Amino acid sequence: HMASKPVWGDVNCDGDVNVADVVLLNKWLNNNADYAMTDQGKVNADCFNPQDANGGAVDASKVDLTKTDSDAIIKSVVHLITLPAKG
Amino acid sequence: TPATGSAEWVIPTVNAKPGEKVTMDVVVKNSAIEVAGAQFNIKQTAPIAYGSAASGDAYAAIVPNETEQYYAFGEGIGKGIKAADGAKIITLTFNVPADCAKGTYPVKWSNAFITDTNGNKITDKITLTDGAIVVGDT
Ligand SMILES: [Ca+2]
Ligand SMILES: [Ca+2]
DSSP states (O other): OOOBOOOTTOTTOSSOOSHHHHHHHHHHHHOGGGSOOOHHHHHHHOOBSOSOTTOOOBOGGGOOOOHHHHHHHHHHHTTSOOSOBOO | OOOOOEEEEEOOEEEEOTTOEEEEEEEEEEEESOBOEEEEEEEEOTTOEEEEEEEOSSSSOOEEETTTTEEEEEOTTSOOBOOOTTOEEEEEEEEOOTTOOSEEEEEEEEEEEEEOTTSOBOGGGEEEEOEEEEEOOO
């Protein structure tokens, strides 16, 4: 599979969006090699200024992952916002 | 290899008079586990009113939903932190109405999920101890 739809915020691909996802993205953002993040995970993690906010299939090699993605995920976890976000 | 030990996270039991603003420091006891992140509700029993939440320095900065009294933290680079004993996870202020009847008003944890540095659930290793505001007289 060369592209995939995001389940927004589910970095670790376990079906839940929670602080495990935040922690693992923060770990990966800090150093890509510390977490074997999947192509699906990458697509899932890119929830701030994503490639396609209507939720169609996207390319994992064209994600833009930053700490702001993590900030959006943790905000979504406590229901302050819904994913995806922009700015 | 999920982080092995334990901690206890304690909402305190405090005395208060009707009309009083109450600051509750929620603290770590017997800290013996590295925690990377957590999410939880803490809710007070009526008619005690909710003021606000403030971050503690036990683990990581609190991201609060004040409407839902739903809170979360995640260490900025995904490291586990073994908090200092007695350190504040979160600080919650409440206000006791002047017409509050004498009694025990629980302040309780719920909907907790706690994670280690590798994304493993460690909620079971953390004892979540409810507290209370015990209202007396005026
Ligand atoms: Ca997840
Ligand atoms: Ca992004």
